[PDB]
Amino acid sequence: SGFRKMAFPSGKVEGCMVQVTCGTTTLNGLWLDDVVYCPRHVIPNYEDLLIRKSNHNFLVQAGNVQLRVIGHSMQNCVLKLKVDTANPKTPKYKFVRIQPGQTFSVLACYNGSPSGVYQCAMRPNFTIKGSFLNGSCGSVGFNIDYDCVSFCYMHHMELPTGVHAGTDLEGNFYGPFVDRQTAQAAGTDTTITVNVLAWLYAAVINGDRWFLNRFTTTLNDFNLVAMKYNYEPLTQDHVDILGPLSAQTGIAVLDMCASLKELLQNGMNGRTILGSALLEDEFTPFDVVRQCSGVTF
Amino acid sequence: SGFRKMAFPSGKVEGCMVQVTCGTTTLNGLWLDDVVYCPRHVICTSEDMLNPNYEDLLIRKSNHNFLVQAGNVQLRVIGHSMQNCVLKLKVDTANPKTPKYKFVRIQPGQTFSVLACYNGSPSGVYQCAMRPNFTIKGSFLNGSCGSVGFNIDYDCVSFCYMHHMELPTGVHAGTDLEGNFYGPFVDRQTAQAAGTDTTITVNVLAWLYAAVINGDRWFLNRFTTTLNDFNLVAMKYNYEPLTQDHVDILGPLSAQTGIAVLDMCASLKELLQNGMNGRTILGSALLEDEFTPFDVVRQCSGVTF
Ligand SMILES: O=C(Nc1cncc2ccccc12)[C@@H]1CN(S(=O)(=O)CC2CCOCC2)Cc2ccc(Cl)cc21
Ligand SMILES: O=C(Nc1cncc2ccccc12)[C@@H]1CN(S(=O)(=O)CC2CCOCC2)Cc2ccc(Cl)cc21
Ligand SMILES: [Cl-]
After folding, report:
1. Domain that holds residue A211
2. Quick check: CB of A134 below 6 Å from ligand 1?
3. How far, in whole angstroms, is CA A20 from its chain's centroid?
4. Is A155 labeled as catalytic in the residue annotation?
5. In CATH, what number is assigned to the domain containing residue B140?
6. Counted domains in chain B
7. Where is the Peptidase C30 domain (chain B)?
8. Cα(first)–Cα(last) distance of chain B, in Å?
């Protein structure tokens, strides 16, 4: 029993975190094999700024050891620093680009030292509601599948509303953001419908059934209602993805959609679901299945 | 900016997790130097759990009855002893991944990270608090026994909890790393229930100061209160009494934000009376009590917005 916001064990990622200094700027880098990956803003015409730098201008520190930079190149908004030593702690890994609604673990670092781990989701407006201070740039997002670390995010900046923006590990931003000081704002955000439904199934599994009702709905009628509460549209793919949870609890996806519709129109009425007075949207269907089954890494 | 429930990086603890098998029971152990620490109920059957005599069960065991597995390697048990409700298995190999560590016993209201494991393999990490009724609201399934709670302030791992059991309400009970239970619980299948739980007042106050640091002040008011009047109101909402120690502990946050502890107490009294009225504080519609004053100082900036 119990339902927590759970992150992946961070050990395989901790052994990759390094500190990168260029002039007055200090941030975090990801050391995999003989390459250190970090935001290109550590150095705007970034090719003109980069051409003026030499390998020795980049100071890379792995723990108490100084790593020697032997080359450098830029890929989109990510700088790749070729180092003379391969990371002996390099895990099995892939660089993956995630979609809005998907969740991941963030290892927040300052000065190449990991300070915390938390779980979060890529919002529909491509921002993340993270917890970051100055010096956190270069901190990474990841998932783990068996023994393979899938790196999906690298932190670049904070938006005026306090939310965060970054890139995949190939340097492509999530969202219409650019790496520079200019007027940028997060777009209007929406609730991840498929994730709220998964969390309602997790509440049923944990013995919370007060919100269930005898009713059902069509996908069209549910989507007409959901659009009015700034909820993301629910697709047939989402319905198919929720199939296992529907079979386990005995509540059809459109039966659970009718429960969600009543919660949106009437509220919780002084009640909570899994210790929350709000509808939670940062657990995917796979997160619910994994936490209510005990998958290990 | 931002405020998340943040756990410590778990790597130093992952390198200590092992699987312990005794007969038909399999659970987790903590391998530090040449000792594996695990719940003593690993020597029990489900039948034994009603009224087990651990001393009588242990005397019948030999070292080779305990199977310890660290990854794909079988460790050899060369000794065993019981200390309160934990079993200490002496092994022939010291853990090369042993971090700098201490065993610390925590008080209710304190927070810690939990590395949930099954079969000696870490599956997840989450943050939680020792409730005033000495239980923890964790996320654990069968096979999670032996999973540990810890803090990593600086580079030293402070082990404070080892998971032993789930109570009927879905809440969890366990021991410090010396085998002493938190709360009036026994590692017995006897009728035991968690006492009525209360809200950790000092932690809700710390979280309200974190909201002020992050730029939110809608809940503040022009009033103050005496400590006694605040406690008379707080007890009516099942909130823990606020002591002078708690007031002293909140001093730094009071100095940083410019809001006196008893003025913040007046805001809390008003939130308890009125609710949030469709508003949230740090993305929450409930008053959060699982961030200590120390957690707020650690996570939040030193400059108020
Ligand atoms: O965002 C950036 N850093 C950060 C990143 N994360 C969390 C932070 C928290 C607090 C302060 C910085 C943070 C940097 C630095 N800044 S900055 O103007 O100094 C910081 C602003 C950010 C918005 O809130 C007000 C303060 C300009 C900048 C421009 C472009 C790029 Cl790509 C990065 C960056
Ligand atoms: O608690 C224990 N294990 C667990 C531990 N943690 C989380 C669990 C979740 C699910 C199942 C077991 C869990 C064990 C075994 N059990 S048990 O009967 O399997 C537990 C009940 C709790 C209510 O839900 C049904 C199962 C009795 C027992 C008695 C004393 C002691 Cl010290 C340990 C233990
Ligand atoms: Cl303590």
Report:
1. 190-293
2. yes
3. 23
4. no
5. 2.40.10.10
6. 3
7. 1-305
8. 9
